[PDB]
């Protein structure tokens, strides 16, 4: 387990370093003398490169190392399933980490990347702007609908179970028997400790579905365009798809500043979007 | 670092406590405001 100590030191030594003594100059600009609203660090210059620490870590090397040492080092479940299952037992938690944390990172660094320069953000507002603009060019996915249903299904299963077991020493204690108080309200648990197995098959199966949906959109899939409503618009229509493709198709057209080589003339007071301004 | 295991008995350990907060700031605020 010496690898986990060398990975958690490089990932924590670069993240705290980039958001304190770095820059960019290749893609916009942030982390200006330890004074940023997000403290982001990724950039990823458009493309052995050099041989320094200030010139090499400027155009890139920051996210190029956080995705090389943080993704490969990984471990976690791979290091615990060979020390716990050998001493104590029950290597079930290793399956949840190899989907809810292993697939969640391996998708944003092997799908969007080289499929081309700037991949994703690694901060607070950096990962919030890339998941906002990146979801603007697509959205309304069938697979990504499961990844959002799992985060609301596993969290609700822990909230309805944590508030039903605590209110179930005294007359309560802890021996279940609350299958008649909750059963008359909504369904019923078959018990058998399936409360922990259902939550594990929800957060791990959702992260694996949302990662597979994001790994497909980048590698050329479909997503956008209902196909049925996109071809059936001769004149008057308007729906929940006609107002969504207009709030993302006109919003992504203007304000373009991501690409420092593809984008050029877009203003001149003749662009898209017109209602009131 | 021998001795016995810690839990909630060791605080500042007397020496190397205030000097530790004077040695770190002597290489952070210096290597930032005038390196």
């Amino acid at each position: 387990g010496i690898l986990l100590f060398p990975c958690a030191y490089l990932a924590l030594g670069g993240w705290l370093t980039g958001t304190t003594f770095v820059t960019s100059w290749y893609t916009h600009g942030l982390a200006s003398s330890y004074l940023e609203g997000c403290n982001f660090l990724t950039v990823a210059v458009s493309t052995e490169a050099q041989g320094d620490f200030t010139r090499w870590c400027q155009l890139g090397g920051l996210w190029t190392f956080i995705a090389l040492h943080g993704a490969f080092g990984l471990i976690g479940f791979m290091l615990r399933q060979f020390e716990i299952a050998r001493l104590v037992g029950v290597r079930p938690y290793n399956a949840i980490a190899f989907s809810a944390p292993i697939a969640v990172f391996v998708s944003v660094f092997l799908i969007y990347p080289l499929g081309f320069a700037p991949s994703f953000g690694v901060a607070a507002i950096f990962r919030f702007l890339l998941f906002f603009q990146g979801f603007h060019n697509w959205t309304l996915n069938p697979f990504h609908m499961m990844g959002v249903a799992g985060v609301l299904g596993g969290a609700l299963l822990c909230a309805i179970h944590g508030a039903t077991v605590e209110n179930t020493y005294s007359m309560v204690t802890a021996n279940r028997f609350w299958s008649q108080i909750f059963g008359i309200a909504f369904s019923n648990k078959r018990w058998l400790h399936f409360f922990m197995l259902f939550v594990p098959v929800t957060g791990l199966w959702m992260s694996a579905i949302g990662v597979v949906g994001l790994a497909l959109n980048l590698r050329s899939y479909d997503f956008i365009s209902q196909e049925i409503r996109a071809a059936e618009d001769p004149e008057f229509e308007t729906f929940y798809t006609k107002n969504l493709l207009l709030n993302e198709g006109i919003r992504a057209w203007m304000a373009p500043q991501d690409q420092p080589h593809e984008n050029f003339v877009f203003p001149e007071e003749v662009l898209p979007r017109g209602n009131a301004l | 670092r021998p001795f016995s295991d810690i839990i909630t008995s060791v605080r500042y350990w007397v020496i190397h406590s205030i000097t530790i907060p004077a040695l770190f700031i002597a290489g952070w605020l210096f290597v930032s405001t005038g390196l």
Partner: peptide, 30 residues
């Protein structure tokens, strides 16, 4: 465990917590 360090290992990387505390106070005052 080791009897040479053991516990004294994580504190080496945590030293960077104070380095980021002073660098953030030097760029906000000037």
């Amino acid at each position: 465990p080791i009897f040479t360090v053991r516990w004294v290992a994580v504190h080496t990387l945590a030293v960077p917590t104070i380095f980021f505390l002073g660098a953030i106070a030097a760029m906000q005052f000037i």
